[PDB]
Write a protein that binds this ligand. Structure first.
Ligand SMILES: CCCCCCCCCCCCCCCCCC(=O)OC[C@H](COP(=O)([O-])OCC(O)COP(=O)([O-])OC[C@@H](COC(=O)CCCCCCCCCCCCCCCCC)OC(=O)CCCCCCCCCCCCCCCCC)OC(=O)CCCCCCCCCCCCCCCCC
Ligand SMILES: CCCCCCCCCCCCCCCCCC(=O)OC[C@H](COP(=O)([O-])OCC(O)COP(=O)([O-])OC[C@@H](COC(=O)CCCCCCCCCCCCCCCCC)OC(=O)CCCCCCCCCCCCCCCCC)OC(=O)CCCCCCCCCCCCCCCCC
Ligand SMILES: CCCCCCCCCCCCCCCCCC(=O)OC[C@H](COP(=O)([O-])OCC(O)COP(=O)([O-])OC[C@@H](COC(=O)CCCCCCCCCCCCCCCCC)OC(=O)CCCCCCCCCCCCCCCCC)OC(=O)CCCCCCCCCCCCCCCCC
Ligand SMILES: CCCCCCCCCCCCCCCCCC(=O)OC[C@H](COP(=O)([O-])OCC(O)COP(=O)([O-])OC[C@@H](COC(=O)CCCCCCCCCCCCCCCCC)OC(=O)CCCCCCCCCCCCCCCCC)OC(=O)CCCCCCCCCCCCCCCCC
Ligand SMILES: CCCCCCCCCCCCCCCCCC(=O)OC[C@H](COP(=O)([O-])OCC(O)COP(=O)([O-])OC[C@@H](COC(=O)CCCCCCCCCCCCCCCCC)OC(=O)CCCCCCCCCCCCCCCCC)OC(=O)CCCCCCCCCCCCCCCCC
Ligand SMILES: CCCCCCCCCCCCCCCCCC(=O)OC[C@H](COP(=O)(O)OCCN)OC(=O)CCCCCCCCCCCCCCCCC
Ligand code: HEC
Ligand code: SF4
Ligand code: F3S
Ligand code: FES
Ligand SMILES: [Ca+2]
Lengths: 285, 59, 74, 44, 103, 43, 321, 196
């Protein structure tokens, strides 16, 4: 048995918003039994914690005071020190430890980046805040739901398609060093989604607009000389706002920890789409 | 089913020069168009007003 | 941000008809004829007018009920 | 121009996502008709 | 919502959907909508125009399609100027007539 | 590719925008009732 | 299979008939722009005048280069036949170059270009040289291309001859400004036979041919012969409207008054010049030695007006529909 | 019969002319997604789309006068009429799929408005029963549709890629507790694995 709850829900929503604004950045000390003298020698990490599986848990910062002279100087090292030594219930993805897998992408103190190859402010006064990627649903602690990112990646058909049979089948698709260097700086993406989680167009329209990373992959498969579905890929990415929604903010190239330039790739894709639209009229006549 | 939630990125990203540079242009254009439309609406509104009446007048 | 302002026509509306260019002269003829008629009527009404004010221009007033309008000195 | 206004409203307003491209086109046609009527009538 | 209000709401939305569907798909109404949609398309996407894409070699393009703009401008300008001249002539005629009639 | 009378189209669109804005905003036909208190008088 | 590019034309219709009545060619596909429904209806109602055989017949509309390329890809032999339309159509020159290029792209066993003079657009500067340069460019794009330039065609599969016969039968006046160069009519049947030989023989180290029908005629002589055959009298330059407007000109009024095909007809009559060049080989080298004599074909009273009737009244405007 | 002549000529011209284009229009409609299948025709180029939509009804309904038709001409007209009827049915099918897609997108939009950051006034922690029932029935209908398209692999693949996208997003919008196992029982079989 249930009844209409528009009024109760509305009042609760407004009141909760006001209170949260009053009590934003809620913080709970991991170990309150710390003399303020000791905290002079220890740096403070504010780690976002949230366990939606537990019905009684709510998001909150947890404060950990750690001696930075016990582990190497990287965000992942500090996170794992906290997990192993202080609280082993902390959750985070980590495979490669050398910035290759791209699993550890998190909001390392105000900037999306891989936690394994990013240092942290050594100063003991300013606190460090570690939170998950911004606009991604949070599963537990620093683990977000990147499923939609992969689903979008699947829609670009990232596999070499060729319309012309190989002449002899005992050779390799010819490609000069120039047609290979055309891909240099473009195939190194590790699909970390750090850039795409920083693109405002991706904030507003996660589904209709592919991220900067996926569009960069489409560009990689387009510029590749061995594939023959150039126009087909261009047309496929030209639908609705799969690409048109990009506003050339340029944050994608700024955040990329690998040093890639997805902004330039998207710009080239836009130019190619414009030329495709024009010459669909100019050529066929 | 407890709906999932997320932390809006713009609430937790250090302010950057790219955001500023691009949103500056967007806000310039937004301001231009809003100013034009609001001026039109203001002229319409003020012209819609009634004429001053006498003191303590009914009808 | 991306630049988008331009005065150029859009290709979506730039098509021609099969038999040649769009029906421009045919519609302009109609427009000119309609303008001629409208402005001729307006000019004829406007210029040939005078205001004659004399006793014969006044008639007895009446209500919406048709009766003669008279208001008491209440 | 009109296209840009519609694009901004779609990208910023979640509710406006409900409208199809067909409804947007109908609004476009009505707006063009009203603009033509406005231009013509103001000179009458 | 309350299951009684749920029944009421489901019935109401079903009635709205049925009414809309009937009105749209009724024979005469369907024909009217179907014809008016195409009329609107013709008006919007095939309105008279002066600029259009030229896909024909100069040998395969009529003269009308090279001087249509000039003909249109001539027609419109001539109409405006002739109306102005007619207005002036009518002003003079009215002035003279009412002057010769009295004072 | 060639567009017949493209320049005419550009100028027509510009004129249409200008006229519509002029009539909608009445930018040129302001109101001066607000300035009357701040004006001198003759006669 | 065969693709006949721009086959709706009367000459194209004759070639298509010749190829269809000779078996082989399990499928013949005719591709044309079909500007107005009148031309499509004309072709279809011709399609009734065909003895049924194994060969299947289909139509394709060349709305854009995509259609042309798709049709060529599904073909083994190609026969291009200039065009029949002037104004608001792609071209008579770009079309042949595109055909040759696409044919080379998707390997084609045989490509034959039939280029009747009567169909060339004579409403442009240096029309004859323009056509020659178009043919040269097309050959450059497809070296294996075979060329067959016909010189005025008669029979019920002709454009100029049929037009003149209709005009004479109905008594329509003819704006006549003949050129000095002699003419050599060729029955379209012989043209179809030559096309068959070109498509079948293969090898064929000689890749330039011309269709030229022995007997030479002046333009006045041709009109006299046609008038005698039809049973009417020529009405040359008998229309004051033609004299005033001079359909040889391309001003606004001239184009918007006379039919475009009639304009091209009179311009062709005025600008005609012999097509044969030193590089062409006559059809006698293809084995077609019994050409139909023009004079013997059009004997007096051998043409009946009823074969050229047209809708006269408002029904005629149904063509414009 | 002059009026009959003009009516038949108009019908022949329009129908035959459009029949040569039906292939292109139908292919373009297939190429786009189901959110706005006529998007290309509304935004980029109306390749005789509205003409086909209008003249399909005329081909179905308006009568014919064979005595005004030839033999090959009449055969061609019948072929073109059949092509236009095929286009009518194809458009109806695409419209049905598009409306189902918009049903799923409506459900997703309600969820998104629920979890929007600006939604300071209508924030709900626990999904209510009505939307849960709507999700369950929508997924049931989607599974039935996928089954009904077993003979058309391309259509089945397109329906998955297009419509099931928002089913997957709905899947991601909620936690795996409460009635979640039952609501997404059918979705968990194959579709859930596809969207990973
Ligand atoms: C958060 C709370 C906020 C509360 C705010 C409350 C505000 C209350 C306002 C009350 C009404 C004021 C009206 C003023 C009218 C002025 C004109 C005038 O005198 O006309 C005479 C008027 C006749 O008008 P008119 O002549 O026909 O036409 C007037 C037109 O404006 C045309 O006249 P014009 O041709 O002379 O026009 C001049 C020209 C001038 O234009 C220009 O040239 C522009 C120049 C701009 C220069 C600005 C410089 C700023 C410098 C910035 C520097 C930054 C540096 C940063 C550095 C950073 C580091 C590097 O155009 C304009 O003025 C532009 C106006 C259009 C506005 C467009 C925008 C609209 C939307 C946005 C609104 C604001 C939203 C704010 C939200 C904030 C949220 C936090 O008749 C009178 O005598 C009326 C006098 C006014 C009183 C009217 C009372 C009406 C009462 C109604 C009942 C309800 C009242 C409710 C009140 C509620 C209170 C809380
Ligand atoms: C003037 C006063 C009277 C007005 C009466 C209006 C009555 C309208 C009733 C409509 C009823 C439903 C119609 C359904 C469609 C049936 C016909 C059809 O399918 O089309 C056949 C035929 C061919 O269609 P199609 O084969 O599909 O061709 C299109 C394809 O894309 C294939 O294209 P293609 O490349 O193969 O080329 C084919 C070409 C073939 O087209 C033609 O051959 C037609 C060329 C034009 C006419 C040529 C003949 C001229 C002489 C006529 C003489 C008539 C005498 C009558 C005597 C009566 C005596 C009792 O098609 C076109 O180019 C289409 C032209 C469309 C023109 C649209 C004009 C829109 C603007 C109108 C207002 C302008 C105001 C400007 C003011 C500005 C001031 C600054 O098209 C037409 O019949 C065109 C009709 C266009 C106008 C209809 C709508 C008018 C609405 C006016 C606004 C009124 C608003 C009032 C407020 C609202 C509440 C009342
Ligand atoms: C005087 C002449 C007459 C004037 C009035 C003329 C009215 C004409 C008819 C207007 C019809 C409007 C409704 C139809 C449009 C579509 C609505 C829609 O999407 O429906 C569903 C959508 C609700 O979606 P939902 O799923 O419930 O929301 C969750 C979604 O995530 C939400 O997703 P979303 O992105 O779709 O939601 C955004 C939503 C916005 O809705 C929201 O989500 C939140 C709305 C409330 C926001 C309140 C402020 C929050 C704090 C911001 C900071 C403020 C600081 C102020 C102090 C500064 C101090 C320095 O945006 C809209 O509502 C779009 C249209 C907004 C503009 C048109 C309406 C203007 C109304 C102005 C008067 C309002 C009443 C008087 C207020 C003042 C009394 C003293 O909207 C509604 O149903 C509500 C409609 C708006 C109600 C009024 C709220 C206040 C708005 C104030 C705007 C002021 C602008 C400045 C110029 C004002 C000049 C007058
Ligand atoms: C139930 C049915 C369904 C209902 C649905 C609901 C909505 C209603 C739908 C109703 C259907 C009609 C709707 C209206 C048409 C909409 C068109 C549209 O949206 O097109 C967008 C579309 C936008 O395309 P775009 O890519 O953005 O490019 C636009 C640019 O502007 C590019 O433009 P452009 O460059 O191509 O130019 C266009 C062209 C268009 O203009 C024309 O060609 C047309 C001309 C006027 C023809 C008017 C014919 C009117 C006939 C009326 C007959 C009576 C009707 C009575 C009916 C009664 C009921 C039966 O402009 C010109 O020709 C420029 C002429 C400039 C003349 C300058 C003069 C110079 C004088 C000096 C000479 C030189 C002196 C030298 C001295 C030197 C001294 C030193 O527009 C176009 O492309 C077409 C051009 C614009 C046409 C506008 C026509 C508006 C008509 C409104 C009629 C309202 C009637 C209301 C009646 C109410 C009765 C109760
Ligand atoms: C207040 C101002 C008002 C005016 C301004 C309005 C402005 C706003 C726009 C309004 C738009 C919406 C209009 C209302 C919707 C009307 C829907 C409708 O008709 O429902 C029928 C429709 C039934 O038809 P259906 O289901 O489509 O057809 C199957 C049936 O079994 C029947 O099968 P069937 O084969 O036995 O009969 C087929 C045919 C009757 O068949 C015939 O007898 C032949 C009809 C003519 C065929 C076309 C021949 C064209 C020949 C060339 C002409 C050239 C002219 C000069 C120009 C040359 C250079 C271009 O009957 C119809 O379906 C008539 C439909 C309307 C005319 C369609 C023809 C369009 C083209 C010709 C007119 C426009 C000029 C084009 C010129 C250019 C052409 C290239 O549904 C209804 O029965 C609904 C009834 C209740 C609603 C109201 C009914 C009103 C009836 C008005 C009749 C008007 C007749 C024409 C008068 C012309 C006077 C000059
Ligand atoms: C940016 C996005 C949004 C953009 C929106 C754009 C909107 C465009 C609108 C276009 C149309 C404009 C119409 C203008 C009508 C103005 C009417 C008005 O209020 O005028 C003022 C009027 C008094 O004027 P007057 O009688 O002339 O006296 C002065 C003469 N010298 O005042 C009066 O007479 C006072 C009484 C009438 C007004 C009553 C208003 C009631 C409002 C109820 C609000 C309810 C909701 C509350 C929500 C909060 C709840 C906590
Ligand atoms: C629409 C364009 C028109 C209109 C308004 C007229 N005619 Fe013509 N006509 C038209 C076509 C498409 C053709 C076919 C030409 C061909 O064989 O390729 C014709 C043909 C004729 C003919 C026979 C051929 C000829 O004489 O050139 C005659 C005769 C003829 N047309 C006469 C004619 C008359 C008297 C008209 C009244 C103004 C007329 N036509 C209008 C198309 C169209
Ligand atoms: S685009 Fe940049 S940030 Fe995104 S995955 Fe590739 S390298 Fe990493
Ligand atoms: S950060 Fe964002 S919108 Fe475009 S170019 Fe870079 S993606
Ligand atoms: S931990 Fe290996 S790349 Fe992040
Ligand atoms: Ca490529």
């Amino acid at each position: 048995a249930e009844s209409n709850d528009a009024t109760s829900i509305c009042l609760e929503s407004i009141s909760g918003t006001i209170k949260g604004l009053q009590k934003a950045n809620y913080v709970v000390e991991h170990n309150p039994n710390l003399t303020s003298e000791e905290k002079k020698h220890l740096k403070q990490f504010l780690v976002y914690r949230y366990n939606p599986a537990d019905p009684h848990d709510q998001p909150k910062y947890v404060s950990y005071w750690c001696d930075i002279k016990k582990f190497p100087p990287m965000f992942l090292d500090a996170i794992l020190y906290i997990k192993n030594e202080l609280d082993p219930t902390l959750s985070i993805r980590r495979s490669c430890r050398e910035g290759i897998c791209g699993s550890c992408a998190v909001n390392c103190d105000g900037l999306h980046t891989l936690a394994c190859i990013s240092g942290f402010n050594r100063d003991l006064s300013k606190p460090t805040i570690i939170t998950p990627l911004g606009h991604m649903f949070i599963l537990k602690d620093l683990v977000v739901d990147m499923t939609n990112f992969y689903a979008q990646y699947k829609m670009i058909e990232p596999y070499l398609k060729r319309k012309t049979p190989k002449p002899d089948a005992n050779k390799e698709y010819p490609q000069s060093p120039e047609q290979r260097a055309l891909l240099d700086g473009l195939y190194e993406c590790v699909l970390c989604a750090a850039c795409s989680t920083s693109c405002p167009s991706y904030w507003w329209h996660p589904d209709r607009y592919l991220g900067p990373a996926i569009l960069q992959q489409a560009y990689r498969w387009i510029v590749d000389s061995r594939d023959e579905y150039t126009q087909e890929r261009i047309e496929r990415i030209a639908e609705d706002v799969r690409l048109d929604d990009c506003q050339q903010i340029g944050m994608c190239s700024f955040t990329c920890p690998k040093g890639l330039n997805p902004q330039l790739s998207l710009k080239n894709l836009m130019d190619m789409v414009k030329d495709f639209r024009q010459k669909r009229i100019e050529q066929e006549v | 089913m407890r709906t999932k939630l997320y932390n809006a990125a713009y609430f937790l990203l250090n302010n950057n020069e790219s955001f500023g540079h691009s949103f500056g242009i967007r806000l310039k254009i937004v301001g231009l168009n809003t100013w034009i439309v609001g001026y039109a609406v203001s002229r319409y509104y003020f012209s819609s007003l009634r004429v001053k009446a006498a003191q303590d007048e009914r009808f | 941000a991306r630049l988008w302002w331009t005065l150029d026509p859009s290709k979506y509306y730039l098509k021609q008809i099969s038999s040649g260019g769009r029906n421009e002269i045919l519609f302009t003829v109609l427009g000119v004829t309609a303008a001629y008629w409208y402005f001729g009527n307006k000019r004829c009404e406007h210029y040939w007018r005078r205001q004659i004010d004399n006793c014969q221009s006044w008639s007895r007033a009446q209500n919406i009920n048709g009766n003669n309008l008279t208001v008491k000195q209440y | 121009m009109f296209k840009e206004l519609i694009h901004i409203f779609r990208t910023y307003y979640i509710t406006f996502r409900y409208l199809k491209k067909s409804n947007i086109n109908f609004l476009k046609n009505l707006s063009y008709t009203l603009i033509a009527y406005y231009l013509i009538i103001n000179f009458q | 919502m309350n299951h009684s209000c749920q029944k009421v709401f489901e019935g109401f939305v079903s009635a709205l959907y049925d009414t809309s569907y009937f009105f749209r798909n009724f024979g005469p109404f369907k024909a009217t909508i179907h014809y008016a949609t195409y009329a609107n398309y013709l008006a919007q996407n095939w309105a008279p125009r002066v600029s259009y894409i030229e896909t024909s070699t100069p040998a395969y393009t009529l003269a009308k399609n090279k001087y249509a703009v000039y003909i249109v401008y001539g027609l419109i300008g001539g109409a405006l100027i002739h109306n102005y001249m007619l207005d002036n002539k009518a002003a003079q005629k009215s002035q003279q007539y009412y002057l010769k009639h009295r004072d | 590719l060639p567009i017949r009378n493209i320049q005419f189209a550009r100028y027509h669109y510009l004129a249409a925008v200008t006229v519509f804005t002029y009539f909608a905003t009445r930018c040129c036909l302001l109101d001066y009732k607000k300035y009357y208190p701040l004006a001198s008088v003759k006669k | 299979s065969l693709l006949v590019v721009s086959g709706a034309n009367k000459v194209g219709q004759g070639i298509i008939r010749g190829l269809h009545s000779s078996g082989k060619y399990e499928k013949i596909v005719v591709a044309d722009v079909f500007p107005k429904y009148y031309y499509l209806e004309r072709y279809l109602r011709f399609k009734d005048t065909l003895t049924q055989n194994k060969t299947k017949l289909e139509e394709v509309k060349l709305t854009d280069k995509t259609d042309l390329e798709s049709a060529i890809k599904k073909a083994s032999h190609v026969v291009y036949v200039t065009h029949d339309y002037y104004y608001n159509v792609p071209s008579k020159l770009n079309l042949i170059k595109h055909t040759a290029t696409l044919s080379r792209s998707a390997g084609v066993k045989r490509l034959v270009n039939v280029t009747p003079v009567e169909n060339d657009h004579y409403g442009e500067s240096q029309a004859v040289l323009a056509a020659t340069q178009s043919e040269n460019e097309a050959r450059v794009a497809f070296p294996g291309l075979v060329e067959l330039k016909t010189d005025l065609t008669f029979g019920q599969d002709s454009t100029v001859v049929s037009e003149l016969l209709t005009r004479l039968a109905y008594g329509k006046s003819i704006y006549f400004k003949p050129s000095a160069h002699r003419i050599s009519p060729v029955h379209t049947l012989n043209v179809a036979e030559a096309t068959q030989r070109i498509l079948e023989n293969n090898s064929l180290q000689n890749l330039r041919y011309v269709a030229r029908g022995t007997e030479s005629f002046d333009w006045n002589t041709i009109i006299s012969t046609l008038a005698a055959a039809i049973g009417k009298n020529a009405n040359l330059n008998q229309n004051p409207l033609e004299n005033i407007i001079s359909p040889l000109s391309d001003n606004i009024v001239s184009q918007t008054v006379h039919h475009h095909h009639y304009l091209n007809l009179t311009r062709f009559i005025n600008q005609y010049q012999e097509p044969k060049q030193t590089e062409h080989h006559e059809l006698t080298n293809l084995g077609v030695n019994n050409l139909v004599k023009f004079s013997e074909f059009y004997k007096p009273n051998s043409v009946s007006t009823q074969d050229y009737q047209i809708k006269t009244g408002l029904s005629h405007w149904a063509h414009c529909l | 019969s002059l009026v009959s002549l003009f009516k038949n000529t108009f019908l022949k011209s329009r129908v035959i002319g459009l029949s040569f284009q039906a292939q292109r229009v139908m292919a373009q409609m297939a190429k786009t997604d189901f959110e706005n299948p006529d998007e290309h025709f509304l935004l980029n180029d109306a390749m005789k789309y509205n003409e086909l939509v209008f003249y399909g009804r005329l081909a179905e309904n308006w009568s014919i006068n064979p005595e005004l038709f030839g033999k090959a001409e009449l055969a061609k007209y019948n072929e073109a009429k059949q092509t236009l009827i095929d286009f009518n049915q194809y458009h109806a099918l695409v419209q049905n799929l598009h409306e189902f897609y918009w049903e799923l997108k409506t459900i997703y939009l309600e969820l998104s408005r629920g979890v929007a950051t600006s939604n300071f006034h209508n924030k709900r922690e626990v999904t209510h029963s009505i939307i849960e029932s709507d999700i369950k029935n929508s997924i049931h209908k989607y599974i039935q549709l996928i089954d009904d398209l077993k003979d058309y692999p391309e259509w089945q693949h397109k329906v998955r890629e297009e419509i099931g996208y928002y089913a997957h997003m709905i899947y991601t919008s909620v936690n795996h507790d409460g009635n979640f196992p039952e609501i997404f029982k059918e979705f968990n079989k194959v579709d859930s694995l596809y969207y990973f």
